Amino acid sequence: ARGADFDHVYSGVVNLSTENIYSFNYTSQPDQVTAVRVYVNSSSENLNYPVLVVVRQQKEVLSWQVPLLFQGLYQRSYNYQEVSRTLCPSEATNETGPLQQLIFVDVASMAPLGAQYKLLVTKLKHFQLRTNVAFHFTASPSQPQYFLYKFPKDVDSVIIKVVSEMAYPCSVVSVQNIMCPVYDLDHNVEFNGVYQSMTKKAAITLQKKDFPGEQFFVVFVIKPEDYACGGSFFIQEKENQTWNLQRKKNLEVTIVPSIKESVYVKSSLFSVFIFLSFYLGCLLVGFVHYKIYFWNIITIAVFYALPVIQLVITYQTVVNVTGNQDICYYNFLCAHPLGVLSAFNNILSNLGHVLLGFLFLLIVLRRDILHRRALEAKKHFGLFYAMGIALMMEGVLSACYHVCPNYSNFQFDTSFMYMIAGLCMLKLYQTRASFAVVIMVTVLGVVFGVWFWVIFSAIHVLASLALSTQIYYMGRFKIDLGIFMDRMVLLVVGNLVNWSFALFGLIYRRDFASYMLGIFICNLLLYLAFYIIMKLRSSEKVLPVPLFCIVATAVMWAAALYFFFQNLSSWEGTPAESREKNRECILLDFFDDHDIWHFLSATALFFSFLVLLTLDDDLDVVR
Amino acid sequence: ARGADFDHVYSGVVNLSTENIYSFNYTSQPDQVTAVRVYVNSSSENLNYPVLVVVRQQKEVLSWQVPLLFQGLYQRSYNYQEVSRTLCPSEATNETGPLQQLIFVDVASMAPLGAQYKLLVTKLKHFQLRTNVAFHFTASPSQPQYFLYKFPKDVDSVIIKVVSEMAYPCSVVSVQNIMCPVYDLDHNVEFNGVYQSMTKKAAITLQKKDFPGEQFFVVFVIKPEDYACGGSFFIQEKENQTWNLQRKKNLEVTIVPSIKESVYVKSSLFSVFIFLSFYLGCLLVGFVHYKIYFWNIITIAVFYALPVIQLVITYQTVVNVTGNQDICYYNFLCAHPLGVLSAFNNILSNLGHVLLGFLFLLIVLRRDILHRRALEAKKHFGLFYAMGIALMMEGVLSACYHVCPNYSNFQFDTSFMYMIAGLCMLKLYQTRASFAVVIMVTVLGVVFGVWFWVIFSAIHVLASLALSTQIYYMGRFKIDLGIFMDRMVLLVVGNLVNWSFALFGLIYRRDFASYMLGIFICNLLLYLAFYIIMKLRSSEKVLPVPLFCIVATAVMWAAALYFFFQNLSSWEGTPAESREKNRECILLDFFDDHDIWHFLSATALFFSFLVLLTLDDDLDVVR
Numbered sequence A, B: 001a002r003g004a005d006f007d008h009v010y011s012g013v014v015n016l017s018t019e020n021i022y023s024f025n026y027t028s029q030p031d032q033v034t035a036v037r038v039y040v041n042s043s044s045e046n047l048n049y050p051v052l053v054v055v056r057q058q059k060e061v062l063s064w065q066v067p068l069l070f071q072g073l074y075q076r077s078y079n080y081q082e083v084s085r086t087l088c089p090s091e092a093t094n095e096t097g098p099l100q101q102l103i104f105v106d107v108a109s110m111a112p113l114g115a116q117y118k119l120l121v122t123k124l125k126h127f128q129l130r131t132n133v134a135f136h137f138t139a140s141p142s143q144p145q146y147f148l149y150k151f152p153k154d155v156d157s158v159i160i161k162v163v164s165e166m167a168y169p170c171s172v173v174s175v176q177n178i179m180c181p182v183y184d185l186d187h188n189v190e191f192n193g194v195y196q197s198m199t200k201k202a203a204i205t206l207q208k209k210d211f212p213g214e215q216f217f218v219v220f221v222i223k224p225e226d227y228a229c230g231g232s233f234f235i236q237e238k239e240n241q242t243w244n245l246q247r248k249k250n251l252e253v254t255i256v257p258s259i260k261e262s263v264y265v266k267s268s269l270f271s272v273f274i275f276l277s278f279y280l281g282c283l284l285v286g287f288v289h290y291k292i293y294f295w296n297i298i299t300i301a302v303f304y305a306l307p308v309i310q311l312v313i314t315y316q317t318v319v320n321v322t323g324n325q326d327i328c329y330y331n332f333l334c335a336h337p338l339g340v341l342s343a344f345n346n347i348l349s350n351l352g353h354v355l356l357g358f359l360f361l362l363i364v365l366r367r368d369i370l371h372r373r374a375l376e377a378k379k380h381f382g383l384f385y386a387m388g389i390a391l392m393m394e395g396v397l398s399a400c401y402h403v404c405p406n407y408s409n410f411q412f413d414t415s416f417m418y419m420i421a422g423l424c425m426l427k428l429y430q431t432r433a434s435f436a437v438v439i440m441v442t443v444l445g446v447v448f449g450v451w452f453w454v455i456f457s458a459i460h461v462l463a464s465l466a467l468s469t470q471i472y473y474m475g476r477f478k479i480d481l482g483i484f485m486d487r488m489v490l491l492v493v494g495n496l497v498n499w500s501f502a503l504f505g506l507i508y509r510r511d512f513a514s515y516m517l518g519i520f521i522c523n524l525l526l527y528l529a530f531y532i533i534m535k536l537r538s539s540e541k542v543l544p545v546p547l548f549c550i551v552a553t554a555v556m557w558a559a560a561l562y563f564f565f566q567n568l569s570s571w572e573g574t575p576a577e578s579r580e581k582n583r584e585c586i587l588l589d590f591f592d593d594h595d596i597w598h599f600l601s602a603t604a605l606f607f608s609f610l611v612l613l614t615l616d617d618d619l620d621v622v623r
């Protein structure tokens, strides 16, 4: 047992009867944290006779073999010559007395000849992380690495933001508590904490009350292959891998505090008040100037929404109790928990639809009962009731989706929109197969899909425009009277550019039902535009209220499409690849780009409903 | 390094400078499998200075400390004095040469005084399991234990049936492949295989083509606490646990072969032909003796069914790629995979509804077009179309549920049944709030819930009967003419016994919406019975066809309720508790008790629809 000292390299040879033993003695003072770390190298001509390293402490035995062997799932084998590990630090309890620690390193091998090794044992100068500072380091599949963070006294929540400038190697960031065994191995990290897979970015939101002693270990473990991440192997770090394989991942970790509760309250107030301003405005506009179908739709909506609410409640609970944060595809850099929600901002963000489709229901209902008055006293208002309920249910089902976004959790709100569309077109056509033509398309490529997939999209986007035009030709009360054609070719160019942008899987742009519904809405609004143009072709004066509504529709739809094209996350890929697109909060420290889309689409879709409703007021005199 | 021999106990004392070393030399012949195992005991006055045991082999280092420490999640601590482990066996390759193996056991401790220990090292006489024999053994949290199974050459699938006669300790049964990292620790078993939690029963279905070399390791790992199983701790094995804690789980494992493909084909044929016999019979019966609502319902059904199909497809894929078999609550003892299905029998079992509700649609449609003939040439057939579509969609959504049964995966088919019920009652009442009264109940206690929960059920079951009677009074074309009351009190006793049989642990046994729908159907059929009795109270002759149909309805509903009361699994509990109720296949080596319920309810529910349809033929002359 050599009285060995730190920071000094020891070379050695071990055979079947050598058993080299080093003894490292050190001390640790109350406040500081020591965190000894052990590096051992071998030379890899040991592969059938590895170098067996055993680190003995007062209460722990850490064994490993050097070369480090890894089994890749396609019957592949990797070995690492450099193996490094940090021993569980035990600090002297505050203001009580320093602790004298003694560590033993036994190096053995069962080889008919020698086995070469090199041993270094250091103390980590920067074990502990600071509350707002970036910290740079490297890790490897064989050299995992963890650090300690101590919560301050006036901080009750933090975000661990880990960033790497290169996608591979695929890594794991877990958050263990301070308890001796640290699980820092490929088969250990996913056991006893919260963890996130990571290619380029990761962000874990920790509360203070979830950690006894108000401190934790953040652990970085580099996987041997990139399959949970996508490319299934990647080594540029070391070109010759059997020679010296070092999947060296460079990391920077910053532990940022979180937003105070004042941000919560003032963003909540901002949203609710900026949408009740529509109420307080329409009230003044309307007062200063002085069915069976409906209940069918509500019965359908309630019993479509209930199982989805239960589903996402279960998903959220599972993600809470398990440390697996690869189930929900959040924007982990703007995701604020309130209770169990874990992303409350992009749920509150759907306040738009729920409030504004209901104000639209009030508007249509007032118009309708005033018409009933003027009729029994001496329009397809069911369609507008359907429109309002579809807005409110997009809001509801979108909040349910944004409880936990998955590859199984979407497809519910878009299916409800398809259902409401089909029901409206049945009730429209009865008063006046293309309906099923969309149903056969929205069900065939639901889960179907290069070139053979292209004709699938090119046929899909075309059949959607036809179903939208065949839908609108029935929904325009003056469809034939208005047109009684240069734009008809121009709209075909809009749809032909729409289809040609879909193509082989994507040309550039994913989710089949959602894409075809986007095409549906685009063609519907473009038909509305063509109808406005044909109204202006005649000398029919557009009243000031639909004037403001069409101006606002165009403006709001531009400002909403901008934020529709952000894509801060995607369930299309692995969780670690989704997680590398999300960025910070742009508005009020609380809302990301997708939340400004849930506001501006619920505002732009309400102004378009209003345009379509209150358009033909100039006919109230031309009966 | 003592030349030490097997099966002999060595006592010893180690201190800061002793480092006892034993050397065990043995040999291994080509065919046989050795599987050395190491037992080490300490005396537990070592708790701050454990006994550190290191087992060195030619290619592996197995370290542990003795006392074995365990952290229970509620800040609890357990220690185990006896620690036993089986070393990864490496067999001499067949017919090539025996292998001489050498094992080292280093026993150390850093104690100012002695540390007592005892060491035994044996060879496992029965490491390998046989293809049809039961094998009894014991395991403990500190003495995990695994065995090797080699597939025979004409067996391509097996079921590992593990049984224990006592619920706790909660255990894990995993199936690793033969590679010397064997993951047999609490933080290892769930990493690299298929695994099942287990209290009393577990059954894992392995294919031969999923194991290179056609053999595997089955690993039994006893958890330190029973939380993934329910009771959060349980030790009767050792009353004084800090003294000598031994959560000793007694296990018996049997590796049974599987059913051949002939069973698949003949059970599939049995089902399809026993249901096409209804076609081949009604054809002879009918030939030897010589709407907007509909498409609304189909549009609702398709777009309610699509997202659920996608959801359960995703669940099944997740369970396939992950080894976690605690996601789906199957009957693991009758669960036959075909492709990715993993339980094909209880999906094929839902062939009843899909075939028989569609034959009912054909019957109602023939009746309807013959009525159209006899009318334009010179009943609420929409309700019967709804009935047939509800049967077919119960079949479809039930198969989707039985792809992967969860606590998030039910609630979809029952919500569709509620939706169809509500739509039918709207369309019925319009031609002639209690509808919403059930909607408020079927939504309040959806996720609400002792005594305060009792009045919840007692009010729920009552409000369901009222909604069913208020539904039937509208659906009986001769509701008032027939009754123009002793059974009305007797039916109240049926409902009063129905509601006083809820209100119990939660509700005298699980799911609120499903229970209230069962009450709904019970009251509907009982109203049908009361109506038959009132028809017979008058001198109105019941034709022979409704005669056979009512006899068959009663018989089939008795024979179906018997199997409704089996409960082979339950998502109401943890997976390991579900798994302890499932039993073997009763019919044709392929169908369990729940599959004979999917046959006999789809047969009994069709005969009741037929009774209700063809009942009032004796009025075709009394118009």
Ligand SMILES: CCCCCCCCCCCC(=O)OC[C@H](COP(=O)([O-])O)OC(=O)CCCCCCCCCCC
Binding pocket: A383, A386, A387, A390, A391, A394, A398, A417, A420, A421, A424, A514, A517, A518, A521, A522, A525, A526, A557, A561, A605
């Ligand atoms: C038939 C009438 C009654 C039937 C009602 C059925 C449809 C009613 C409209 C409500 C549809 C709706 O809510 O849109 C939902 C999606 C939003 O999906 P997500 O990404 O926000 O989850 O919205 C979109 O995906 C829109 C994407 C692009 C739309 C904007 C393009 C229009 C811009 C100007 C035209 C060029």
Ligand SMILES: CCCCCCCCCCCC(=O)OC[C@H](COP(=O)([O-])O)OC(=O)CCCCCCCCCCC
Binding pocket: B386, B387, B390, B391, B394, B398, B417, B420, B421, B424, B514, B517, B518, B521, B522, B525, B526, B557, B561
């Ligand atoms: C208004 C007409 C249109 C309404 C549409 C719905 C009407 C019924 C059609 C479909 C009914 C149905 O599918 O029952 C589903 C459930 C089965 O659920 P599961 O356990 O099998 O997954 O079945 C049950 O849970 C039934 C439970 C037992 C009830 C039968 C007992 C009757 C015995 C005789 C009287 C005591």
Ligand SMILES: [Zn+2]
Binding pocket: A398, A402, A594, A598
């Ligand atoms: Zn969204």
Ligand SMILES: [Zn+2]
Binding pocket: B398, B402, B594, B598
């Ligand atoms: Zn079933």
